């Protein structure tokens, strides 16, 4: 990375101004004579004691243990930005009642308790409690700062390198601090190539949230990367809390310690709009945040398979050779990707007429193999009078403009390019409509989309992005909306894929840039990483930081984007990627070809093994995503989410869990012959999924490994569903029989769910065409029952096998199901491992049934 191309806090005038304010007595005070209390909110005027500027505080109790704080100017020269389209609804409120009041303080009770809010007038402060337990304080260090709109180096016009920001509205930054007593561990605020547990920023830079295209980004630093989710989670043995700072402008976050952690948010423009999510459990915080910004869109099943990409497959013959290569080497793959060279000179929605002359025929061939293709579509449009997309956007005034009213022109892949104003709802409608099969000539239903460079990336722009003073829909400046530009591109593309199918097909869109709410539109990935071991390691904390803030469909380029990975690293990367939500191999233009059959047999075999593990686990992955979609719970989880009282798990980032059932510790060092695996849980047991060896928690196990090892353990008390018949793509497998892997707890119990539907439509929601089964084992009986009776589905899927770990040898196995006489099943038992295999139950997955041992 070239750090000089990106601003440090001292180079961002608003950050320097805000950060120069040090702890002390706040000049802000609440004017309690102006206090007004209604059923939905409390409002009160605040005044700055020196400037005499008046602000309005709108304080609200909310349902589900949350509090909203909004501060804006009482009489602004012009309205301040309020972030649209991120919140899914107007949050239901809870009534505030005055339970105490004096000349300097007001105590408010939320609904009928136990939550309370103390408003101190001078200096202005808010304290949030549950009964007598103080959870959080606001403005405790007196760092609130609200720069009012006026009619000081860099406060007005400001230059960065060769770029001048005309800054017509001058200094308008907002900032506020929060104190978290009892909290020593905080997480979130992606995207940074840094540790899962966030570092204190006291003696260095704050964390930066500003969607930027950072070429050859480096590790373990707070530089802003491609996406920004302004959500911070705090965890202790006693409680979980969340802070959601709803602001779309450049934001800097300072973290400091004292036990107590203090957080300061500093934003360029807009209002102060913050949600305090009081838990108490981390799952309560996930539900709270999901109620505000929605949940992960349910991926079509194929998008959870393996994706093969590079910059670039040369032509149709290369795509078809790659397709045939997977089949000739018995390696599954669902999708083949087409990067920017597939288009006509990077005019999106077009095809190179020599390389891709017959895209419908190429898509037909992939469809005959039950595979999909993904084509890149970026949000920069070549300035070319012969290009219809440019001519239509120019003619309809849908481009971002400069202050003089001309269409902004920057430099990107097609050379001179303009930037559609995705903040304009008519621009988004036009974009969605461009994905119709009539408009996007050469597209077909098995063609999905990748949105890259949507920060937006501008090669000749400041920090490789758009001018701060460019003008968007409604007269808002680029500085006001920057961090939601990419989200809008993602949203409009997803809606395009839904609309082209008549609203029936679920979309699949990968996006580089993102914000709060991006989970509703598809997948994200960690951008242009490098083919190095420390980048392989950092994929875990980066995707875990995203999972915690609702973006469950995350991944990193398998093999690394830049440079050539050695075969051992490529193998370990396939193994890591095979257990991460978005699983794609991708590579830079200058790299050698790295399709997995080009390696020596030992490496091919380890890669095929990893692919087979992933494909067999698709029913499990699909179910976790359904739980993410319905509840807002993360798919990939830090161990502290499952073990909140185990303080040794709070900073772990070389291990993770998938749901509550699998613990993964991928090998991430060259020449490793073993790994230290921490298996948590008092009275918990863990099964090595390969050997079936049972291990008691809590312990650190030194596990020996070879090239083909993927250290994975199943938790006792869980039931994992698999498709053991691995075929060439997920479509081929989606009607096949299931094998249930029952891992018994020390009490001889287990449970697990299974979600099934057609694999690709909204019929599960519009027609309740799905199955949600609950499998439960207790007292020598395994039972299948409905976990949601509203769901019905016509399916040939049946239960072909049950594998029970931790079971003794039965004398007999009986199956009962309505409509059939009692059945006797044959079985095999290994006394060394205590693994019992039940042969061919033969029952429909849509039916209730019971299997009794003995």
């Amino acid at each position: 990375v070239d750090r000089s191309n990106f601003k440090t806090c001292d180079e961002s005038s608003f950050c320097k101004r805000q950060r120069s304010i040090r702890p002390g007595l706040s000049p802000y005070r609440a004017l309690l004579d102006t206090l007004q209390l209604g059923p939905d909110a409390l409002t009160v005027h605040l005044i700055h004691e020196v400037t005499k500027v008046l602000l309005v505080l709108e304080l609200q109790g909310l349902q589900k243990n949350m509090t909203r704080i909004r501060i804006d100017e009482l009489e602004p020269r012009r309205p301040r930005y309020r972030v649209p389209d991120v919140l899914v609804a107007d949050p239901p409120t809870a009534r505030l009642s005055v339970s105490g009041r004096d000349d300097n303080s007001v105590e408010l009770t939320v609904a009928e308790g136990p939550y309370k809010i103390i408003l101190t007038a001078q200096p202005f402060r808010l304290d949030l409690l549950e009964d007598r337990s103080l959870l959080l304080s606001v403005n405790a260090r007196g760092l609130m700062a609200f720069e009012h709109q006026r009619a000081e180096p860099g406060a007005w016009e400001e230059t960065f390198k060769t770029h001048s920001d005309s800054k017509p509205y001058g200094p308008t930054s907002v900032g506020l601090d929060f104190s978290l007593p009892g909290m020593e561990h905080v997480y979130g605020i992606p995207e940074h190539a840094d540790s899962l547990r966030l570092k204190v920023t006291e003696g260095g830079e704050p964390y930066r949230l500003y969607n930027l295209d950072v070429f050859q980004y480096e590790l373990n630093n707070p530089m802003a990367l491609y996406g920004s989710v302004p959500v911070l989670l705090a965890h202790s043995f006693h409680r979980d809390l969340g802070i959601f700072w709803l602001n779309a402008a450049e934001t800097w976050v300072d973290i400091s310690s004292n036990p107590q952690t203090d957080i300061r948010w500093m934003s360029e423009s807009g209002i102060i709009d913050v949600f305090l999510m009081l838990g108490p459990s981390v799952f309560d915080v996930f539900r709270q945040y999901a109620s505000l910004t929605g949940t992960q869109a349910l991926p079509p099943l194929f998008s959870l398979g393996y994706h093969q990409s590079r910059w670039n497959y040369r032509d149709e013959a290369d795509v078809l050779e790659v397709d045939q290569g997977f089949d000739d080497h018995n390696m599954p793959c669902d999708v083949i990707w087409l990067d920017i060279e597939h288009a006509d000179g990077k005019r999106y929605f077009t095809w190179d007429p020599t390389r891709f002359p017959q895209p419908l025929n190429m898509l037909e061939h992939l469809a005959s193999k039950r595979r999909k293709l993904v084509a890149i579509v970026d949000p920069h449009i070549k300035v070319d009078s012969g290009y219809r997309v440019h001519e239509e956007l120019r003619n309809h005034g849908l481009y971002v403009k400069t202050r003089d009213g001309s269409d902004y022109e920057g430099w990107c892949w097609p050379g001179s390019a303009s930037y559609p104003d995705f903040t304009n709802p008519r621009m988004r409608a036009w974009w969605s409509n461009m994905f119709s099969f009539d408009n996007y000539e050469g597209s077909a239903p098995n063609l999905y989309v990748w949105n890259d460079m949507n920060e937006p990336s501008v090669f000749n722009g400041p920090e490789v992005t758009m001018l701060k003073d460019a003008v968007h829909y409604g007269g808002w400046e680029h500085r006001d909306i920057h961090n939601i530009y990419g989200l809008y591109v993602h949203m409009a593309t997803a809606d395009g894929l839904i609309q082209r199918s008549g609203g029936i097909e679920r979309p699949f869109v990968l996006s580089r840039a993102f914000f709060s709410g991006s989970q509703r539109f598809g997948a994200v990935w960690t951008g242009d990483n490098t083919a190095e071991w420390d980048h392989l390691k950092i994929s875990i904390p980066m995707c875990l930081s995203l999972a915690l803030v609702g973006l469950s469909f995350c991944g990193a380029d398998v093999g690394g984007f830049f440079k050539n990975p050695e075969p051992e690293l490529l193998v370990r990367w396939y193994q890591m990627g095979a257990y991460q939500p978005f699983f794609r191999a991708h590579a830079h233009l200058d790299t050698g070809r790295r399709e997995p059959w080009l390696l020596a047999s030992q490496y091919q075999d380890a890669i095929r093994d990893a692919l087979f593990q992933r494909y067999s686990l698709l029913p499990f992955w699909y179910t976790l995503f359904y739980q993410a979609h319905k509840e807002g719970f993360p798919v990939m989880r830090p161990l502290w989410v499952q073990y909140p009282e185990d303080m040794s798990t709070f900073s772990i980032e070389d291990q993770f869990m998938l749901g509550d059932a699998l613990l993964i510790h991928p090998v991430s060092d060259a020449g490793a012959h073993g790994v230290q695996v921490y298996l948590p849980g008092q009275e918990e047991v863990w099964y090595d999924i390969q050997s079936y060896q049972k291990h008691h928690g809590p312990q650190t196990l030194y596990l020996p490994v070879t090239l083909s090892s993927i250290p994975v353990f199943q938790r006792g008390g869980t039931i994992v569903p698999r498709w053991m018949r691995v075929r060439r793509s997920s479509d081929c497998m989606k009607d096949d029989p299931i094998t249930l892997f029952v891992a018994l707890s020390p009490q001889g119990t287990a449970q697990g769910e299974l979600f099934l539907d057609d694999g690709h439509t909204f019929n599960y929601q519009t027609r309740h065409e799905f199955l949600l089964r609950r499998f439960s084992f207790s007292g020598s009986t395994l039972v299948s029952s409905s976990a949601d009776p509203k769901g019905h589905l016509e399916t040939p899927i049946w239960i072909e096998r049950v594998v029970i770990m931790g079971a003794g040898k039965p004398a007999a196995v009986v199956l009962q199901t309505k409509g059939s006489p009692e059945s006797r099943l044959s079985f095999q038992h290994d006394p060394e491992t205590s693994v019992l295999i039940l042969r061919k139950p033969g029952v429909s997955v849509a039916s209730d049934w019971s299997i009794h041992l003995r």
Binding site: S368, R370, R725, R727, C732, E800, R839, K840
Partner: protein, 83 residues
């Protein structure tokens, strides 16, 4: 008499042959289905060269045999392309 796996690992009644559940370590009890991970399906390709395919390609909805016999209960109707 019963069926003996070509690898000698088990002896099963012929009712467990092509019953869509894998009983032999070599996959020899399921030559006509997709049940075994290491089985093979024989494309008879009457009038042309016969071919063997992976068992996982039986009823996968993809036409693997030129005679189309690998797709007999998938919904994909394969045409004879042996020439």
């Amino acid at each position: 008499k019963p069926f003996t796996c070509l690898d000698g690992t088990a002896t099963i009644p012929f009712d467990q042959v092509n019953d869509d559940y894998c009983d032999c370590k070599d996959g020899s009890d399921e030559p006509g289905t997709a049940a075994c991970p290491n089985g093979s399906f024989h494309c008879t390709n009457t009038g042309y060269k016969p071919l063997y395919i992976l068992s996982s390609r039986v009823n996968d909805g993809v036409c693997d045999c030129c005679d189309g016999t690998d797709e007999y209960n998938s919904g994909t109707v394969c045409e004879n392309t042996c020439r």
